[PDB]
């Protein structure tokens, strides 16, 4: 019967709720007292990357912490040098509705997908000079929300038809397919060892997946609305979120429940992308009221504000060495906040 | 300028990339980006056949004006999470089939098909993004609308109608049930047109109504309005 299975599933929901309550002996906010607070961190705009002409919807730092791809809502995908703010490439995309962007961690490839449901993969370091499309990864139904390279041949593209996927670039077919979400998937983040990834969604639930196994390890819940930001802790054992009830939550993969919450009562707006710092002490979350504000990650004190943008900060990225923070907004500028 | 011979020639690449974005940000500013919304079973395919995956950009020129229409009906995803991509369109072309006033949708409980295209109309007028973007509204299939209003009245879809089973007494009733769904009578205009087989004068309506939007958007950009 369909009725007795819903009679059973809530008991398993009542068993996971009891098991997480058997482990919540001490809150993180009371363990993370009796330590030094981080104090106010002020970060000034060091660069402004100007050349876009529409809403920057995504960016991704290249793994050398100097290059920077940035997909915006014209047909362009500009690869910025950051240290002397030149444009290394400008890649005219085939559909100008791109909701995501990814720099491959070898430097060679760059992917961007969007409302065309297709994850085009570009080959920068080539022989004939110009940046060339190597693949167009079809096969999703809804819009693409986030693309992430594991290496130069696997890419994890979470789309909006309630499904993530794992691709093989050299062939062009989905190897696995991570389903189990209700409602859209809005952002993913690979673990720093690239074995697991989480995937925030529009049913207020992140979900820890395994790229080798093929289905969900554990499903986190606790938000009130659409989760549209995910960042792993740099340890790779916890992860933040960000949602449209204007609150972050630091979850944990080993305790299977959220550890703290990041809400100020003077913000009501919603979150577009979060990102930890190096060492996992800051939780720089990008909000709809045009400002990032650096939460301390252990105590919920809002330890600064990166207001320099004239519209919604819709993409946020900390370098792989932690030397700078690049945010990009719905006005076409992309300020780098060292 | 303490730049090397290659650091100088890298900036010359950045300046000749900038000169190709600004030269392609003027081929993109000359074009008019519409947005063909509408519910299912309306006749959006009647209109993109009258002119010329997920999104499908349709290009067509009229009187040296290059248009672009984005039919997002093939998305089948949540409309909330990508409708801010079209925040700066010129004019939301809407489509309402007049002929679905007596048809129903089998999925939801009551689900008059006209009652949901009215509810999508209220959901895109009153978006926080579509404050300025003036809706062009195409009431499709008025020729099929006469050949079933002489049989069946509009009192099915709307109890609050007091009139006879005639076209003009009721086709203008639907327009005044649509033009008042916006809570912004001051910020945007709703242009309405009754397309059946009017295939010459539908792009002419869009060229006139976009030129009305282009003029009023200029006169606020100058401050004069």
């Amino acid at each position: 019967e369909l009725d007795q299975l819903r009679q059973e599933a809530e008991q398993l929901k009542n068993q996971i709720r009891d098991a997480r309550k058997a482990c919540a002996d001490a809150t993180l906010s009371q363990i993370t007292n009796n330590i030094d607070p981080v104090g106010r961190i002020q970060m000034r705009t060091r660069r402004t990357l100007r050349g876009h002409l529409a809403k920057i919807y995504a960016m991704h730092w290249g793994t050398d912490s100097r290059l920077l791809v940035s997909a915006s809502q014209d047909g362009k995908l500009i690869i910025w040098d950051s240290y002397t703010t030149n444009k290394v490439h400008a890649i005219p995309l085939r559909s100008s509705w791109v909701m995501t962007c990814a720099y491959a961690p070898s430097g060679n490839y760059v992917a961007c997908g969007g409302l065309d449901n297709i994850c085009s993969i570009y080959n920068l370091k080539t022989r004939e000079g110009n940046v060339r499309v190597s693949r167009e990864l079809a096969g999703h139904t809804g819009y693409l929300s986030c693309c992430r390279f594991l290496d130069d041949n696997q890419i994890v593209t979470s789309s909006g038809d309630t499904t993530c996927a794992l691709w093989d670039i050299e062939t062009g077919q989905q190897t696995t397919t991570f389903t189990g979400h209700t409602g859209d998937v809005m952002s993913l983040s690979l673990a720093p060892d690239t074995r697991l990834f989480v995937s925030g969604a529009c049913d207020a639930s992140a979900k820890l997946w395994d790229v080798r196994e093929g289905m969900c390890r554990q499903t986190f819940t606790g938000h009130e609305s659409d989760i549209n930001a995910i960042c792993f802790f740099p340890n790779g054992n916890a992860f933040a979120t960000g949602s449209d009830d204007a609150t972050c939550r630091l979850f944990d993969l080993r305790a299977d429940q959220e550890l703290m919450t990041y809400s100020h009562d003077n913000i009501i707006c919603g979150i577009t992308s979060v990102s930890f710092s190096k060492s996992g002490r800051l939780l720089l979350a990008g909000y709809d009221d045009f400002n990032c504000n650096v939460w301390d990650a252990l105590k919920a004190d809002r330890a600064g504000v990166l207001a320099g943008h004239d519209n919604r900060v819709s993409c946020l990225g900390v370098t792989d060495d932690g030397m700078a923070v690049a945010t990009g907004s719905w006005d076409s500028f992309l300020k780098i906040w060292n | 300028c303490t730049l090397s011979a290659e650091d100088k020639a890298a900036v010359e690449r950045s300046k000749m990339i900038d000169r190709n974005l600004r030269e392609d940000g003027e081929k993109a500013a000359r074009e008019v980006k519409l947005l063909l919304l509408g519910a299912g079973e309306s006749g959006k395919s009647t209109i993109v056949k009258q002119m010329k995956t997920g999104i499908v950009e349709t290009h067509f020129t009229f009187k040296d004006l290059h248009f672009k229409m984005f039919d997002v009906g093939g998305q089948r995803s949540e409309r909330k999470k990508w409708i801010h991509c079209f925040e700066g369109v010129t004019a939301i072309i809407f489509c309402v089939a007049l002929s679905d006033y007596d048809l129903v949708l089998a999925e939801d409980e009551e689900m008059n098909r006209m009652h949901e295209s009215m509810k999508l109309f209220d959901s895109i007028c009153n978006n926080k993004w579509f404050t300025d973007t003036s809706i062009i509204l195409f009431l499709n299939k008025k020729d099929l609308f006469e050949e079933k209003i002489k049989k069946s009245p509009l009192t099915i879809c709307y109890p609050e109608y007091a009139g006879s089973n005639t076209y003009e007494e009721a086709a203008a009733y639907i327009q005044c049930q649509f033009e008042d769904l916006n809570k912004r009578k001051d910020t945007k205009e709703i242009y309405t047109h009754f397309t059946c087989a009017t295939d010459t004068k539908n792009v002419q309506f869009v060229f006139d109504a976009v030129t009305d939007v282009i003029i009023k958007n200029n006169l606020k950009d100058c401050g004069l309005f």
Partner: single-chain antibody, 231 residues
């Protein structure tokens, strides 16, 4: 990807000739192109330069004012009109391509090179003779500038070229330590400042040829006289 060259012949001194190279196989309009000549018993020597979009043209001081480098980017050809040529302008005139962005490899492709016979500044000091060597041997080929090549941005602009004889030189080490695409990994460059070494750890007989170093800090743009290798 090739860069074939036209022109060539035997003009009288005071005469003129127009070299042209037809570049095909790459997006030519975004490549800074060069002209590099090689006197027939001697090493390489730099002649002219045109940038992407022809927006910046340099010349060497020996051929400044007489030579005019130009190109037609829709035609995918690069010219060099030489006027009032001397008897020291007899050389094989290679064409080079070089794209400059962050992390690019300039001078990566060299043309065939047409001989143009005529009828009769950083200095790079290699100074090493035709070294006889057995394969499998670690060879250190050392160049030495007259300036600290390490720029303020941390890049050391030294390039290492292998001209196998009968061919055009090809890039090996496209900055201080880097390696061109296609060079086997046994080649390695080392050093900083003024003293640089190209160390081929494993050897063969296929990488025999003469080895030029080149600086790239500023557009004098001189080559070293090549350390010849032989078996």
């Amino acid at each position: 990807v090739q860069l074939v060259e036209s022109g060539g012949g035997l003009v009288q001194p005071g005469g003129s000739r127009k070299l042209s190279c037809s570049a095909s196989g790459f997006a030519f309009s975004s490549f800074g192109m060069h002209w590099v000549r090689q006197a027939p018993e001697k090493g390489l020597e730099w002649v002219a330069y045109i940038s992407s979009g022809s927006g910046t043209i340099y010349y060497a001081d020996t051929v400044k004012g007489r030579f005019t480098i130009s190109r037609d980017d829709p035609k995918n050809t690069l010219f060099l009109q030489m006027t009032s040529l001397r008897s020291e302008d007899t050389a094989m005139y290679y064409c080079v391509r070089s794209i400059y962005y962050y992390g690019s490899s300039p001078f990566d492709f060299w043309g065939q090179g047409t001989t143009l016979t005529v009828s009769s500044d950083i200095v790079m000091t290699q100074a090493t003779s035709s070294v006889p060597v057995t394969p499998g041997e670690s060879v250190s080929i050392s160049c030495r500038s007259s300036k600290s090549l390490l720029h303020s941005n941390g890049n050391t602009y030294l390039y290492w070229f292998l001209q196998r004889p009968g061919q055009s030189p090809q890039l090996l080490i496209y900055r201080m330590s880097n390696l061109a695409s296609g060079v086997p990994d046994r080649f390695s460059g080392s050093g900083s400042g003024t003293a640089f070494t190209l160390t081929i750890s494993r050897l063969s007989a296929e990488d025999v040829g003469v080895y030029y170093c080149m600086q790239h800090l500023e557009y004098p743009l001189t080559f070293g006289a090549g350390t010849k290798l032989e078996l």
